[PDB]
Design a protein around this ligand. Structure first.
Ligand code: V4K
Ligand code: V4K
Ligand code: CA
Ligand code: CA
Ligand code: CL
Ligand code: CL
Ligand code: CL
Ligand code: CL
Lengths: 8, 226, 226, 8
């Protein structure tokens, strides 16, 4: 289950 | 960081991101917040990205050690407790910045939803490692922060707004992973995806890209959950 | 780490590697060395891997900032100086462990070549960032450490020994990147590769794999340099 | 120019 990815 | 200029802290936080020095980036942005001034949209992103990276590495290390601990002297439990305590300190630091005094001074919907989403995220991270007499109160603190941000975002933001979409995505993960409510998780992700789909026709090509990227993350979770 | 058992420090250093917590791993192995006892072959690898990871991230961040600095307020130079100072502190810490008292107590060829190779590596890392009145003396300190390790390894180790091969590989990189001696770098890598090739027939399948892996690294550099 | 890789 993926949350908003941290970095960019 | 009290002796460094606000602009220099922001300047060095962007350099730290380029160098992938996320602990430095978080310390720079912590000093920028403690100058007492509200954060711009870009500055809010710098704060979020910095601490999300730092706590992200701590969570990954915690899960490695907790898995070894469960498979199994006191060394494994001691070191897991060590990483767990440092993770809780970072979460407490972010929650302290939001409480002093980012949230109370956030009047716009964009800023207030952003900070309340952060508050739910870092209470969710505390909930991932909690086992004692506070576990339920920590879970409710995450739910309460997410719910207030959800209420404002539905009233004040279009269904395609990236912050609104990311909020619903993380709140859905909270329902599935923390609150033991997979049906609530699936319903929120599905309703969020469908209402954003119907609003895509209003967007420019650049905003279209921003929204559909997060919509695919919702789709990924739905494929995993159904 | 003076209050923790030697075995617990070694135990937790292996856990830190699994969790990719390399600063913790280095601190654990620093405490293990400071117990005063010599290191086993495996323990020497734990010490080397820990600090090579920590300084590796510092070097990568230094090169990002130094590139931005060269393209170009004082923020970029200040932050580069900050990372550079912390890199030099880690290198000084490793060199202090080798000097107190790992090297003087290393009598076997395997241990002594290993520590002297480390000494050349961390003086080479100091040389990468040096610009002042010490730059030449730091370069000579790296050359002297590499040369003593080379002399012992040629006398005491077979040409296929992984430590001997890795020593020659890093010494060749020193010649190319630090000493401005690309012809010396190419000659060492070529002679090392060829003499290891002629000794492969003596090895088992597992030792064959160990040696040919490092031999390919020598081949990669030769392809890049010729 | 590659040195000995750090970790494993
Ligand atoms: C809560 C939140 C954060 C970020 C976005 C967003 O616009 N994303 C996801 C990651 C981002 C890089 C970090 O800024 C790129 C696209 C939405 C919601
Ligand atoms: C100086 C040195 C170090 C390590 C080797 C070796 O056997 N290698 C390269 C990296 C290693 C993982 C770290 O132990 C795997 C193969 C040779 C020479
Ligand atoms: Ca000022
Ligand atoms: Ca003891
Ligand atoms: Cl510990
Ligand atoms: Cl305001
Ligand atoms: Cl600085
Ligand atoms: Cl001895």
């Amino acid at each position: 289950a993926g949350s908003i990815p941290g970095r960019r | 960081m009290g002796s460094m200029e606000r602009a220099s802290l922001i300047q060095k936080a962007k350099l730290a991101e380029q160098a992938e020095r996320y602990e430095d980036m978080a310390a720079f942005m912590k000093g920028a917040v403690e100058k007492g001034e509200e954060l711009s949209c870009e500055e809010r992103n710098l704060l979020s990205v910095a601490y999300k990276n730092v706590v992200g590495g701590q969570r990954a290390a915690w899960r490695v050690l907790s898995s070894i601990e469960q498979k199994s002297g006191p060394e494994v439990r001691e070191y897991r407790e060590k990483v767990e305590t440092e993770l809780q300190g970072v979460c407490d630091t972010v929650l302290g910045l939001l409480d002093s005094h980012l949230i109370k001074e956030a009047g716009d919907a964009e800023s207030r939803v952003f900070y309340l989403k952060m508050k739910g995220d870092y209470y969710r991270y505390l909930a991932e490692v909690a086992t004692g007499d506070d576990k339920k109160r920590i879970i409710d603190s995450a739910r309460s922060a997410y719910q207030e941000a959800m209420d404002i975002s539905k009233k004040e933001m279009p269904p395609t707004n990236p912050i609104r979409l990311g909020l619903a995505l993380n709140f859905s993960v909270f329902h599935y992973e923390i609150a033991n409510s997979p049906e609530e998780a699936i319903s929120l992700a599905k309703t969020t995806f469908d209402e954003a789909m119907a609003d895509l026709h209003t967007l420019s090509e650049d905003s279209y890209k921003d929204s559909t990227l997060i919509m695919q993350l919702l789709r990924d979770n739905l494929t995993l959950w159904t």
